[PDB]
Amino acid sequence: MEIAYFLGCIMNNRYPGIEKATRVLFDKLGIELKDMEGASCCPAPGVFGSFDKTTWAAIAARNITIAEDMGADIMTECNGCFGSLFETNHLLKEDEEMKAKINEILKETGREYKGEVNVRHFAEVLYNDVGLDKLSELVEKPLNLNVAVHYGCHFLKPSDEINIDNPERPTILDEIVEVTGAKSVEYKDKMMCCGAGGGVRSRDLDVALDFTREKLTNMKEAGVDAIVNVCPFCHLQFDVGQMEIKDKFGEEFDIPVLHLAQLLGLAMGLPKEDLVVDAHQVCV
Amino acid sequence: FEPKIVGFCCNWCSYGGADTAGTARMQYPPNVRIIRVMCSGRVNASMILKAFSEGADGVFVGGCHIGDCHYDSGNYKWKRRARFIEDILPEFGIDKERFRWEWISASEGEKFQKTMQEFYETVKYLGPL
Amino acid sequence: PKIGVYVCHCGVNIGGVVDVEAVRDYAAKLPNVVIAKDYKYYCSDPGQLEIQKDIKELGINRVVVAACSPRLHEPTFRRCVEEAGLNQFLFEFANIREHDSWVHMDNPEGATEKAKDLVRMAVAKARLLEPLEASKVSVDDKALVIGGGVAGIQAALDLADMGFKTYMVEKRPSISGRMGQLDKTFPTLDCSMCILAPKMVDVGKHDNIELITYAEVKEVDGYIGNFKVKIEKKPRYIDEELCTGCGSCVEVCPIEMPNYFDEGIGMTKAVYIPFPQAVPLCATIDKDYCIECMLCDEVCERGAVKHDQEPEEIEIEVGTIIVATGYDAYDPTEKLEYGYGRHTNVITGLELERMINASGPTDGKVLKPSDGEKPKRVAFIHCVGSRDEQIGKPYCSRVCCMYIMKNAQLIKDKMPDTEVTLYYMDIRAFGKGFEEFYKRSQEKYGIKFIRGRPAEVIENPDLTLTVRSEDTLLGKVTEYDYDMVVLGVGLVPPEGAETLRQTIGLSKSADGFLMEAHPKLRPVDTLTDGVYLAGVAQGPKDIPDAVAQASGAAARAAIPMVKGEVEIEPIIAVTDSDVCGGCEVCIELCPFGAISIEEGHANVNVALCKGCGTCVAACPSGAMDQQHFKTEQIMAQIEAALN
Amino acid sequence: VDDKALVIGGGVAGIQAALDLADMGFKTYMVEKRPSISGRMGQLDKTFPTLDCSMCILAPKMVDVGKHDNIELITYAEVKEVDGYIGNFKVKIEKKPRYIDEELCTGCGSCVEVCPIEMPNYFDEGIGMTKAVYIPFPQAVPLCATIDKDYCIECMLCDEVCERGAVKHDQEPEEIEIEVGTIIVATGYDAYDPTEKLEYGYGRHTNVITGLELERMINASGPTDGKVLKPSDGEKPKRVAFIHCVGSRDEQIGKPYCSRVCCMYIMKNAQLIKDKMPDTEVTLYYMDIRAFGKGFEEFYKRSQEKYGIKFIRGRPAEVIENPDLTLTVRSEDTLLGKVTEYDYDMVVLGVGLVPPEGAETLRQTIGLSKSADGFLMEAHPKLRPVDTLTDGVYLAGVAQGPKDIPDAVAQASGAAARAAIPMVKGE
Amino acid sequence: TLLQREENIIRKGNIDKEFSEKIKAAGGDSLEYCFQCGTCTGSCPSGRRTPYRVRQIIRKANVGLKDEIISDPTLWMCTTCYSCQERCPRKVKIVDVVKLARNEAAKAGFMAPAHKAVGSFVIKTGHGVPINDATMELRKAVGLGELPPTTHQFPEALEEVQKIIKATGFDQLIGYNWETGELE
Ligand SMILES: Cc1cc2nc3c(=O)[nH]c(=O)nc-3n(C[C@H](O)[C@H](O)[C@H](O)COP(=O)(O)OP(=O)(O)OC[C@H]3O[C@@H](n4cnc5c(N)ncnc54)[C@H](O)[C@@H]3O)c2cc1C
Ligand SMILES: Cc1cc2nc3c(=O)[nH]c(=O)nc-3n(C[C@H](O)[C@H](O)[C@H](O)COP(=O)(O)OP(=O)(O)OC[C@H]3O[C@@H](n4cnc5c(N)ncnc54)[C@H](O)[C@@H]3O)c2cc1C
Ligand code: SF4
Ligand code: SF4
Ligand code: SF4
Ligand code: SF4
Ligand code: SF4
Ligand code: SF4
Ligand code: SF4
Ligand code: SF4
Ligand code: SF4
Ligand code: SF4
Ligand code: SF4
Ligand code: FES
């Protein structure tokens, strides 16, 4: 199997360990990751979708046309990038005049959007294409960890279009986490936003940090050992906002932040160097 | 060019659909002429061929939705007859786009209006037979 | 053929678009027409008098009316002609209002030409019409009532008091329906059982009522006055004729199973009596839980225990049917954000009704499911399972507001110190005394109303519940703690509704309930003749509305049974034996098997034939022909439509 | 027990009850105070939630009543005395003088065309005119003319133009005595008069109308030929406001009950205005939207989604007439939490339902008790909705309380059954 | 003084019907059919720590209070978490309405400096979060290239992105100055 590999911005520019773990895991699983040469920001929905819909859609359409020229479906392991690309794909597929406008914009770049590929999430690919049995067969050593799973808002919502899992009480990420031996611990307001989406992190950092602080308080009384996410935008929010909260209000949350790929690599016995925990501001 | 169109509609759903379109005041071209039958199963190829031979430029048949026939299964028989009629008509220079058959429920006035308008446009574009 | 043509102005509904002078003038000049007249309102009494006078004077033997759709007024003009001596089937209808005038307003000239063509087609058909005598069939003076709730009980008692022998089929072991489960009723707060039990006893004692409980209707065949009904009586494993309802078998039984009457919060034995006021007061054994220990067999003194009982098949012949199957309560398990079935102290309105009743499982004490202790804070949530497109329930359940307020008032009455809060979108206190009841909920009992549809219910570690909801009138989010949360679940069609609907052959409305013949003027009739609706079977409503509907259904079903005869339409196939070759390609095309072969010729049974015309269309040689829809008539109409 | 019944009121409820009783084989009298039967249903243009034509479905029933062998129709008459008991009621009725012979009049209308005196038409609810001799509406049953002597000048032109000799200026009131076994009261309702709501300015502001007046105006056969026009200048309003709960749920006027139908017909009339005039802006001021009946919530959603009718949750504080005769509604938007002063070309008051004129006299004549809301009281609020504690007397329709057409029809059929039971038993 | 003659009353002067029609035509059609139940606001996580009220935004959009919406800071408190849209009993596309209102606000000049900085980063490098030296060395240590195969590595891809930005008008919206490569 071959699938186009979209990196985004945060994973490849602040936390390359997630990218390394994903590459190693997908090489082990027998899936070829094809690089989307010349890809750019998806662009992050929070700012670009809020400022100008046409520009956001055009940039996302160019990103999609890269994968269309390679023949493959796009795989992304970021909730924000998945949301942006997936939303642009269904809009253009089910909207001919918008498609014509986007193609008129794209003509100057020597590209044309054809609506020929699908946008897929890393977790969804792991759950469906691979299955839990194959993932279990690859676990070299079970983990002894209590983890708080952060689904992120844009993994499963809007659920009418995505149709991956129930957005109120999902279980997909919990199952993928638990095949590793880690225990997915329930905590209050588990499905709450991290506060980074919609451009809020850069508009009002205090509000986003309040989101993150409420989530961290709930996770801490749940008595968890780590946070598992499938969004580099949530990953960065948690990791950097823990220290920001430490400096601002002095509250000391010392919960490591791990991407699902990093947790799978830990359960698969990958080298400690490949996880690149040095990029994390919260020590793992 | 104003095409001549003849319509056959079952008493229970398609005729009811036309009545619903009328009550809602849904306008459509006046070329069609509706003939009432109790069931679409009453319609056979002889009526369609007679209509085309007498000067009709289009023939419409309306029936209950499959599974909704008042008389249980007449519309199935009509559907078979209609497929055979579409087979037969082109052999004598009559385009099968001049013969339309649809399932219209008694409450589907808007669908009936759209069907009438689109069929009129098609038949007019085809021109005189 | 002397054809008289009557073009209706309908005020300005045809006249305004179509020239009822130019159209009458053409009709007078068309071959075989001996009169052409126009009247403002022909369906009215003066118009029918004009038609009758014309028939009597000019000797018209064919009547053509250019008026609205035949589906509206064909029977009207048919009985008009007869009172003036003509046969009913000599009359023709031209549709120039729904088909011509209301759909071609922007083309008056095209509208008039279409009206001329349609009247020409109508006269062409009328030329070849012939008299057909319609056959009368007797109407059985018996009624079946399906469902033993308040509506069904009312319908059965009304029919039996009017003298008709009535059957009442009830799937539960006892009658009462949902009204027997209620403690009190709004807006009066009177005891529901105290007023329902006498009616149940009346049903159980009536000479004209045959009560068949623990039974279901399996098959329905036939038509109005002539319904054949196959009913399946499930085995009680208790002899109804012998059992006295003492309850010793219940006392000795070792097995415990849920009591359906208590709605999942009450227990009884494998042998049980649903409630003390059951009618018939008889025991029932649920074999899913019976271990065949024979203790009930040994303790019974009447010898009423029958562990070898079998299901029984009953066949009845009735003239009318009244469906009164009621409803089920919405199951809010799918509303995950409210946590029903997951949070311990979240209950439904019907469960609260069972819990507040003195005869309920808790002896009338409102107690928390978690600890057996009275809640100090209670929240009610309105519109659960209703007015929600996220679950495909876009309708109002019409009673949840009032019974929510009633149960809040009852909780305040029993436990005055309790705090009660209601979360509502609209307060629909529309009925008689309902607005006063709504005001009394605040003035007298001090119930708190928050206009806000709750976003979430969160269970805290101590098992209390935080309702997170906006107060839209304060315009602010609130998170309030409560010891108990009650979901105001709506009403849905009962389990097995589709099976019975298909068995009878009825249609359903958009909300899933059974559809009435006309929303405004025939609320209790259906389009199936001889079948009527009563109560929540037709849609959610309160007890007085259901009782009124039951009485109306009784009247409507009594009308034809008093008449004793119905007319059969004669639009049936007829075989020309001299032309028929006995090819038999027509028999299988009749879904009712009306066609057989006698003496090598096709023969149609009038009773079985319904008049679809499929066989006639199938016959190549034309031996088969439908009355009133002959091939020559339709061919003439086709010819006139284009010439 | 006598096998004859008396139905008082010729509305949809009374028509249904009389037809049901007649079809069951009982000889029935119908008494109607107006010259023709139909009630308020005959005045409506369409009906919610289907927007079907009211008259198109009511007229066949009126004709059936008028030509039934088991029904004796006595219009323009009033019940004067009721004596006796169940099965043994002696009823004295007075047929008011039409001054037109019912047996001779064909309702051609020539006398109307020739009459020189203009007078208000009761069927048009104070916004339509007719002559001193009039037929209330074309579908009237009986189709017969009536002369109102409060306006007649005795010019005799009607006598000259009448070919049937049906004009009778010397007619006198007639006394009728009937013996019946059961009585069904179906006297309906009157629309609440909002003149006393001084802040809304009905009767003072030119462009303030009621819902029933709007029904007559929008009716294609109404005084304006179905056109919604400003009373001030006869032009179409570009902005229309609707006010809910006028005369209802208001303790300041002693009306603490819900009228149960004003929400639905307000939404229906807004939809009809939008259908006729798609460019009109329609706003509704409501407290609760009571869309409880079958298909009513969907009707409300359709009002918002398909027609773009605006809903403001707020009971208006005042209606102010501007110098140019436009109307400013001053009301809080409680969901915005702010006071709004919006301008409109027409304001329609969603008036409620009250017992009809002369209700107390008939109630005392029969001897019935009334409920707290002022309507007639039933024997049991739950299990006997159409019975009264007086044996042999039954209630049907809005006589028992506000409700819509299907509820009244069901009540009428149930009352027919309940009255038939004693007559079937015979003792 | 508490006196304020304009902020405490709504008249036709505060209403812009063209704004409502524009939002509805651009994909906010559903806001026409809000019944103001308040489920959205109760579900909103930013609603209980900021003055942001989503239901009131929907109501103002329906009414046509353009100035009250586009100039509102709280409009930017929505994280687009979609909870309200998931729970709306009328199926209103709440997030689409919020984004259309934000687009109008940006066109009106209500843009945060940090959002403009993100846009300028995308213009300059093609990435909302461009790479830094520390991440470059981290990548080289783990065998990833020094630069990811994005607009960082391929100048022609950056040129295509900048052409898209120029064609869509984004440069003008954020006030990006090509000559000096700054914001004005
Ligand atoms: C919690 C709650 C509180 C309420 N409180 C009040 C109140 O205070 N006042 C009030 O006026 N109304 C109240 N109502 C409404 C009231 O319950 C209904 O209006 C009334 O029960 C309807 O009666 P019914 O006979 O139409 O239906 P039901 O009461 O449901 O009776 C239907 C009967 O049909 C039977 N049946 C179903 N299917 C079949 C079948 N296939 N074959 C045979 N029999 C069948 C059922 O078992 C049952 O015996 C309340 C409702 C609820 C849910
Ligand atoms: C503006 C408006 C719009 C409405 N729209 C709808 C709608 O769209 N759909 C719907 O279902 N319902 C609608 N309704 C409600 C509907 O009008 C009533 O449900 C219905 O008219 C009740 O019929 P009724 O026969 O009980 O009473 P009425 O219609 O009032 O008829 C009563 C009859 O009794 C007569 N009468 C009165 N007193 C006496 C007396 N002393 N002696 C003899 N006769 C007497 C009256 O003159 C009249 O003929 C609407 C109501 C209003 C006000
Ligand atoms: S016959 Fe039909 S068209 Fe003529 S007045 Fe009656 S309803 Fe109207
Ligand atoms: S089965 Fe026997 S012991 Fe049991 S209730 Fe009936 S009579 Fe009593
Ligand atoms: S035989 Fe069955 S019902 Fe009887 S006592 Fe034993 S378990 Fe109970
Ligand atoms: S009656 Fe009240 S609680 Fe029940 S569905 Fe209607 S609005 Fe909701
Ligand atoms: S199809 Fe015609 S010829 Fe053949 S058996 Fe039937 S009636 Fe006779
Ligand atoms: S007309 Fe229809 S029902 Fe009648 S015999 Fe033929 S196929 Fe049967
Ligand atoms: S009174 Fe004479 S003129 Fe007047 S409507 Fe009657 S018949 Fe015609
Ligand atoms: S006599 Fe009276 S009713 Fe007749 S025309 Fe003169 S004023 Fe009119
Ligand atoms: S039905 Fe609606 S408008 Fe009429 S009184 Fe009740 S709440 Fe007010
Ligand atoms: S949940 Fe939907 S209907 Fe309710 S206030 Fe929010 S947008 Fe409006
Ligand atoms: S999408 Fe915006 S308005 Fe909706 S819940 Fe999330 S933050 Fe609140
Ligand atoms: S009745 Fe319409 S298809 Fe059979």
CA of D288 to the centre of ligand 11 (A): 7
In angstroms, rounded to a whole number, what is the distance separating the alpha carbons of residues A261 and E30?
39
Give the residue, out of C588, C605, C621, C631, with the most ligand 7 atoms within 8 A of its beta carbon, to mutate for a pocket test: C621
Q: Which atom of ligand 1 is nearest to the CA of C536?
A: 26
Q: Which amino acid is at A45?
A: P
Q: What angle do CA C497, C500, C501 make, to 5 degrees?
A: 80
| DSSP category for residue C515 | P
Question: What is residue C514's DSSP assignment?
Answer: B
C228 three-state secondary structure: strand
Bridge partners for D340 per DSSP? D331, E10
Return the residue of D nearest to C562 by Cα.
Answer: D24
C298 burial level (CB within 10 Å; 0-12, 13-18, 19+):
exposed
B80 to chain C, any CB pair closer than 8 A? The answer is: no
Suggest the residue from B38, B49, B70 to mutate for an interface test with chain C (most C CBs closer than 10 A): B38
Partner residues linked to C499 by β-bridges: none
Give me the residue label for tokens 């007023």. Answer: C195
Q: Residues C75, D63: contact at Cβ < 8 Å?
A: no
Report the DSSP beta bridge partners of residue C39: C8
Element (H, E) at A24: helix A16-29
DSSP-derived 3-state class of residue B4: coil
DSSP letters spanning C53-105: HHHHHH--SEEEEEES-HHHHHHHHHHHHHHTT--GGGEEEEE-IIIIITT-T
Contact D382 C544 (CB under 8 A): yes
- HEC sequence for E73-102: HHHHHCCCCCHHHHHCCCCCCHHHHHHHHH
Nearest to D202 by CA among D309, D43, D40, D350: D350
CB contact under 8 A, D341 and E11: yes
Q: What is the 3-state secondary structure (H, E, C) of B8-24?
A: EEECCCHHHHHHHHHHC
Q: Does C248 touch chain B (CB under 8 A)?
A: no
**CA dihedral for D138, D143, D149, D150, sign (positive or negative):** negative
Question: 10 Å Cβ neighbour count for C474?
Answer: 12
> How many other β-carbons are positioned within 10 Å of the β-carbon of residue A128?
11
CA–CA separation, A144 and A267 (whole Å): 10
- CA C392 to chain CA centroid, Å, is 21
| C458 to A188: CB separation less than 8 angstroms, yes or no | yes
Using CA atoms, how far residue C230 sits from C38, C499, C639, in Å, is 53, 14, 50
Sign, CA dihedral C111-C112-C113-C114, equals: positive
A198 in Cβ contact with E79 (< 8 Å)? yes
Q: Which of A41, A153, A195 sits opposite E82 (nearest CB)?
A: A153
Q: CA torsion angle for C257, C261, C263, C265 (degrees, to 10)?
A: -50
How far is residue A166 from each of residues C393, C455, C524, E42, measured CA to CA in Å?
19, 17, 42, 20
Dist CA D71 CA D235 (whole Å): 46
Measured from the Cβ of residue C315, the count of other Cβ atoms closer than 10 Å reads 9
Please say whether the beta carbons of C96 and C115 come within 8 A: yes
D30 phi, psi to nearest 5 deg: -120, 130
Evaluate whether B104 touches B14 at the Cβ level (below 8 Å): yes
Which two three-digit tokens encode residue A109? 């770049």
Residues of A in contact with E132 (CB under 8 A): 13-14
Pairing of strands D346-351, D208-210: parallel
d(CA B12, CA B14): 6
Which residues pair with residue C132 across a beta bridge?
none
Rounded distance between C-alpha atoms, residue A124 and residue A120, angstroms: 7
Closest CB to C337: pick one of A168, A188, A189. A168
Q: Given a contact as 3+ CB pairs under 8 Å, which chains touch D?
A: C, E
Distances (CA, A) of E116 to A41, A47, E80, E123, E179: 15, 9, 19, 10, 17
Which H helix or E strand runs over B61? strand B58-63
In chain C the first and final C-alpha atoms are separated, in Å, by: 21
Query: Is the separation of the CB atoms in B32 and C107 below 8 Å?
Result: no
Contact residues, chain C to chain A, C-beta under 8 Å: 336-337, 458
Positive or negative: CA dihedral C214, C220, C224, C225: negative
The C-alpha atoms of residue C99 and residue C113 are separated, in whole angstroms, by 13
Distances (CA, A) of C161 to C199, C207, C307, C555, D416: 13, 10, 38, 11, 13
Nearest to D105 by CA among D49, D162, D55, D29: D162
Provide the 10 A C-beta neighbour count for residue C294.
Answer: 10
Query: ∠ at Cα C436 (C435, C440), nearest 5°?
Result: 120
Q: Is D106 in the pocket of ligand 9 (CB under 6 A)?
A: yes
- Give E25's DSSP letter: I
* Pairing outcome for strands A226-229 and A257-259: parallel
Backbone phi, psi, residue A179, to 5°: -60, -20
Q: Do D341 and E10 touch (CB under 8 A)?
A: yes
State which ligand 14 atom lies nearest to the alpha carbon of B10.
2
Number of A–C residue contacts, CB under 8 Å: 6
C301 by Cβ neighbours in 10 Å (0-12 / 13-18 / 19+) ranks as exposed
The answer to whether the CB of A200 falls within 8 A of the CB of E77 is yes
Closest of C166, C173, C168 to residue C148, by C-alpha: C168
Q: Which residue is listed with tokens 């008032």? A: C409
Ligand 14: atom nearest CA of B71 is 4
Q: Residue C238 gets which letter from DSSP?
A: B
D142: preceding bond cis by omega (within 30 degrees)? yes
- Contact (Cβ atoms closer than 8 angstroms) between residue A113 and residue A104: no
3-state SS, one letter per residue, for chain D? CCCEEEEECCCHHHHHHHHHHHHCCCEEEEECCCCCCCCCHHHCCEECCCCEEHHHHHHHHHHHHHCCCCEEEECCEEEEEEEEECCEEEEEEEECCCCECCCCCCCCCHHHHHCCCEEECHHHCCCCEEECEECCCCCCCCCCCEECCCCCCCCCHHHHHCCCCCECCCCCCEEEEEEECEEEECCCCEECCHHHCCCCCCCCCCCEEEHHHHHHHHCCCCCCCCCCCCCCCCCCCCEEEEEEEECCCEHHHCECCCCCCHHHHHHHHHHHHHHHCCCCEEEEEECCCCCCCCCHHHHHHHHHHCCCCEEEECCCCEEEECCCCCEEEEEEECCCCEEEEEEECEEEEEECEECCCCHHHHHHHHCCCECCCCCECCCECCCECCECCCCCEEECHHHHCCCCHHHHHHHHHHHHHHHHHHHHHCC
Query: D211-218 and D262-276 helices cross at what angle (nearest 10)?
Result: 40
Beta strands E176-177 and D77-85 are unpaired
A181 sits in the region (left: phi over 0; alpha: psi -120 to 50; else beta) called left
Chain E residues near residue D305 by CB distance under 8 angstroms: 32-33
From the list E100, E112, E149, which residue is nearest A37 (CB)? E149
Burial class (CB in 10 A: 0-12, 13-18, 19+), D402: buried
Q: Give the Å distance between the CA of C326 and the centre of ligand 1.
A: 5
Do E154 and A38 meet the contact criterion of CB atoms below 8 Å apart?
A: yes
Backbone angles phi, psi at A165, to 5 degrees: -160, 165
3-class secondary-structure state, position C602 = strand
Distance D241 CA to ligand 14 centre (A): 46
Residues of A in contact with C332 (CB under 8 A): none
Decide if E9 and D341 are in contact by the 8 Å CB cutoff.
yes
Please tell me if the CB atom of residue C481 comes closer than 6 angstroms to any atom of ligand 5: no
**From the candidates C9, C40, C44, which should be mutated to test the interface with D, based on the most D CB atoms within 10 A?**
C44
Q: Tell me if there are at least 3 CB pairs under 8 Å linking chains D and A.
A: no
The dihedral built from the CA positions of residue A247, A248, A250 and A255, taken in this order, carries a sign that is negative
| Nearby residues of C530 by Cβ (< 8 Å), 6 or more positions away | C223, C224, C225, C227, C319, C320, C321, C557, C560
Residues C94-107 as b or e (16 or more Cβ within 10 Å = b): bbbbbbbbbbbeee
Residue-wise DSSP of C110-153:
HHHHHHHHHHHHHHHHHHT----PPEEEE--SEEEEE--SHHHH
Collect all residues with Cβ–Cβ distance below 8 Å to D398 and sequence separation of at least 6.
Answer: D11, D13, D188, D189, D353, D375, D408
Q: Provide the CA A188 distance to its chain's centre, in angstroms.
A: 22
Q: Where are the alpha helices (DSSP H) in C512-595?
A: 543-563
Tell me the structure's resolution in angstroms, rounded to a single decimal. Answer: 2.2
CB contact under 8 A, E90 and D313: no
* Distance (Å) of CA A122 to CA A3, B84, C336, C468, E50: 11, 52, 26, 33, 34
Q: Alpha-carbon distance A247 to A243, whole Å?
A: 6
Rounded to the nearest angstrom, the distance between the alpha carbon of C182 and the centre of ligand 5 is: 29
CA angle at D135 for the pair D132 and D141, rounded to the nearest 5°: 150
Q: Which two tokens stand for residue E118?
A: 């993100």
Q: What distance, in Å, lies between the first and last C-alpha atoms of chain A?
A: 33
Alpha helices in chain E (DSSP H): 17-23, 39-43, 54-63, 66-70, 83-87, 94-107, 113-125, 133-141, 155-168, 170-174
**What separation in Å is there between the alpha carbon of D259 and the centre of ligand 11?**
6
Closest CA to A258 of A249, A267, A246, A250: A267
- HSE (CB half, 13 Å, CA atoms) of C462? 6
State the binding site of E for [4Fe-4S] cluster. Answer: 34, 37, 40, 44, 78, 81, 84, 88
Helix (H) or strand (E) holding C456: strand C456-459
Side-chain-side CA neighbours of E136 within 13 Å: the count stands at 8
Label residue E154 left, alpha or beta by phi (over 0 means left) and psi (-120 to 50 means alpha).
beta
- DSSP-derived letter for residue A279 is G
Backbone angles phi, psi at B22, to 5 degrees: -65, -45
Q: How far apart are CA D305 and CA D301, in angstroms?
A: 6
**Whole-number Å distance between alpha carbons of B5 and B60:** 7
